[PDB]
Amino acid sequence: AMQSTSNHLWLLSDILGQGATANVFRGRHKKTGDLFAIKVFNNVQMREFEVLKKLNHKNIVKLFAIEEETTTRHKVLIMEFCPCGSLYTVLEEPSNAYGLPESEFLIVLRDVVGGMNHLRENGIVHRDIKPGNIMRVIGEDGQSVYKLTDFGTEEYLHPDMYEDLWSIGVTFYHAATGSLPFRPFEGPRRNKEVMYKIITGKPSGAISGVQKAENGPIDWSGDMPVSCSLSRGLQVLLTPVLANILEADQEKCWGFDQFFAETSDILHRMVIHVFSLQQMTAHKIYIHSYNTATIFHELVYKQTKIISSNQELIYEGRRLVLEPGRLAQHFPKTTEENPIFVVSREPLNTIGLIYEKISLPKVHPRYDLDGDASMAKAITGVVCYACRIASTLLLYQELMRKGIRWLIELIKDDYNETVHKKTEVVITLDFCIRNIEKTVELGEISDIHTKLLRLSSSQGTIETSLQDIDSRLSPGGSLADAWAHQEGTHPKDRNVEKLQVLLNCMTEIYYQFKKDKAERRLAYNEEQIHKFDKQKLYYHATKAMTHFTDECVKKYEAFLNKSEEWIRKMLHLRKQLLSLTNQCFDIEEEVSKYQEYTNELQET
Numbered sequence: 235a236m237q238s239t240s241n242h243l244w245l246l247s248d249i250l251g252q253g254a255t256a257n258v259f260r261g262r263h264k265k266t267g268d269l270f271a272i273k274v275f276n277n278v279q280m281r282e283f284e285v286l287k288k289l290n291h292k293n294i295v296k297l298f299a300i301e302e303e304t305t306t307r308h309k310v311l312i313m314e315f316c317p318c319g320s321l322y323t324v325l326e327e328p329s330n331a332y333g334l335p336e337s338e339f340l341i342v343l344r345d346v347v348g349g350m351n352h353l354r355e356n357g358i359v360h361r362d363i364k365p366g367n368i369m370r371v372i373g374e375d376g377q378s379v380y381k382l383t384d385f386g387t388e389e390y391l392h393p394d395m396y397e398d399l400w401s402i403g404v405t406f407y408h409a410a411t412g413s414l415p416f417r418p419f420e421g422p423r424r425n426k427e428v429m430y431k432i433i434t435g436k437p438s439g440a441i442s443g444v445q446k447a448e449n450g451p452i453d454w455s456g457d458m459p460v461s462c463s464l465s466r467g468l469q470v471l472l473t474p475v476l477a478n479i480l481e482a483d484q485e486k487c488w489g490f491d492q493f494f495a496e497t498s499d500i501l502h503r504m505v506i507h508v509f510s511l512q513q514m515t516a517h518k519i520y521i522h523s524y525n526t527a528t529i530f531h532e533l534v535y536k537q538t539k540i541i542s543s544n545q546e547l548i549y550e551g552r553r554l555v556l557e558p559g560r561l562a563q564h565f566p567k568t569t570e571e572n573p574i575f576v577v578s579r580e581p582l583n584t585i586g587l588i589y590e591k592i593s594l595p596k597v598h599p600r601y602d603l604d605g606d607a608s609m610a611k612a613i614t615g616v617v618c619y620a621c622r623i624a625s626t627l628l629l630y631q632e633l634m635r636k637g638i639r640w641l642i643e644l645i646k647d648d649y650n651e652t653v654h655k656k657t658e659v660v661i662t663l664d665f666c667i668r669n670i671e672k673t674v675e676l677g678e679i680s681d682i683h684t685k686l687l688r689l690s691s692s693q694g695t696i697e698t699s700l701q702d703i704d705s706r707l708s709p710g711g712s713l714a715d716a717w718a719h720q721e722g723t724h725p726k727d728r729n730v731e732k733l734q735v736l737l738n739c740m741t742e743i744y745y746q747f748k749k750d751k752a753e754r755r756l757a758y759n760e761e762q763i764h765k766f767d768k769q770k771l772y773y774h775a776t777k778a779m780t781h782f783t784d785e786c787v788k789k790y791e792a793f794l795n796k797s798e799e800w801i802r803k804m805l806h807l808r809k810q811l812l813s814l815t816n817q818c819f820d821i822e823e824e825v826s827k828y829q830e831y832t833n834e835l836q837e838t
């Protein structure tokens with residue numbers, strides 16, 4: 235049994251969304267077979283609907299046609315089908331439990347801004363903008379395309395409306411943290427009066443408010459949480475956009491013009507991957523393609539506290555000199571796995587990766603379909619976070635090995651250039667100390683030898699202290715990079731995939747418990763499968779956390795502690811080689827004062 239139209243038909247079982255106004259079924263066309271989103275209302279229109287047909291934009295669900303159902307003669311809207319679901323469906327997946335991927339987050343902000351801007355050009359106010367109103371379609375290139383459609387909700391209401399840019403800030407915060415900005419203890423339900431008190435608390439610059447105890451305080455914060463998977467350079471640019479659109483004061487609200495301007499400023503910036511080799515931290519510099527390298531070094535300082543003049547950059551196994559006027563679009567293309575390593579002559583503290591240390595929540599024995607579903611969602615998102623951090627720690631070590639194996643070659647290049655200047659001074663020394671012996675009033679020559687022999691003696695001390703450094707940059711010479719290959723984790727250990735196997739099992743059990751919650755009750759047979767897999771959900775999470783801490787973190791902290799020592803020994807050798815090379819330049823000119831002095835007397 236199902237309803238039909240002159241051109242479309244849909245099964246009642248293939249129901250998509252169920253709302254107060256209407257329900258949307260997944261239907262097909264009678265003549266083509268193409269899938270459409272059919273909207274059948276349960277219960278002026280002929281004009282406001284045809285004006286929504288001509289609305290053609292990439293970030294707007296196309297309203298194809300308006301037809302009348304056969305049996306009930308109900309107005310039916312034929313809308314574009316979005317097989318991936320809504321943004322809320324995307325945020326329900328455990329991989330996005332603590333925030334969307336950074337690239338996926340930029341697609342959301344681009345489509346949402348690009349969609350409402352087209353709606354403002356036509357003059358349509360959305361009133362309610364939530365992840366449920368933002369559909370997801372896969373584009374012809376494989377990247378997601380987000381669209382608006384339903385043009386509210388309790389959690390996304392303005393404080394004055396609780397009694398337009400507000401719900402947009404709550405959506406972006408939810409998409410970036412994987413959680414809501416203003417959450418009471420027992421959730422926005424019976425603590426609804428607390429939720430209103432949280433919004434009327436208007437801390438202006440702060441964007442979050444977590445009541446971690448029943449009827450307790452409200453933990454405010456102006457920055458994003460540590461679990462946020464966005465880069466630190468993106469949080470710096472995203473925080474002021476939200477804080478200025480999350481306060482009830484229309485006097486202090488931004489409006490769409492300043493909002494669209496500052497958001498367009500973020501999307502027009504290219505990414506330059508920079509890995510602080512001495513701090514063992516990866517960064518992303520959001521810089522416009524027309525900015526100079528001077529502003530680039532400014533952003534590197536604001537993210538690493540490294541002075542611009544001391545920033546020495548490495549790329550693809552060679553040094554990199556950035557001209558202060560070289561535009562950012564002419565920089566070499568960088569990835570997360572091939573960045574621009576930054577090193578400095580000043581000593582830098584070795585920090586590593588900073589992440590939120592979360593433990594497994596306890597599993598309850600109560601057979602509750604809703605409880606087991608909400609429990610399986612949180613515990614699977616925790617393993618996704620630990621699986622995310624594990625791959626980030628592996629990347630940090632692999633980036634560390636390349637940056638160290640490169641930096642030793644860059645130092646061996648500085649050593650070989652010192653040898654070139656040494657051979658220039660040795661050749662000049664010999665051809666001037668012996669050209670005097672050939673010609674050889676006594677004080678004018680004896681003073682030279684007491685000075686030439688002092689040069690050849692101090693020049694030789696450079697040679698001995700140089701071949702010592704050549705012995706230090708040799709294999710096993712108290713500075714080899716062999717320990718990096720024998721300390722932390724490696725892709726050969728396959729630790730990220732060992733955690734990803736247990737993650738898929740936990741996600742399948744989660745998706746099954748998500749189906750088991752839709753069914754109001756289960757049969758005795760299906761009930762014990764739900765209980766048996768609920769116990770396997772704990773054994774999988776316990777096996778993952780054990781392998782994560784007792785292998786991934788221990789090897790990482792052993793590699794990090796070994797890295798902090800090798801950095802000191804490397805900074806010490808760089809100061810010696812620099813002094814020894816400066817001791818070759820000042821004596822290169824000291825032999826320039828004597829090569830022309832007495833060797834060229836005056837006589838007619």
Ligand SMILES: Nc1nc2oc3ccc(C4CCC(F)(F)CC4)cc3c(=O)c2cc1C(=O)O
Binds near residue numbers: 316318319369383
């Ligand atoms: N045009 C629209 N297309 C829509 O396609 C959809 C396609 C698939 C799904 C499922 C959602 C939850 C799940 F079952 F677990 C996995 C897939 C939902 C929708 C949907 O909700 C929708 C709404 C509209 C609208 O305009 O409201």
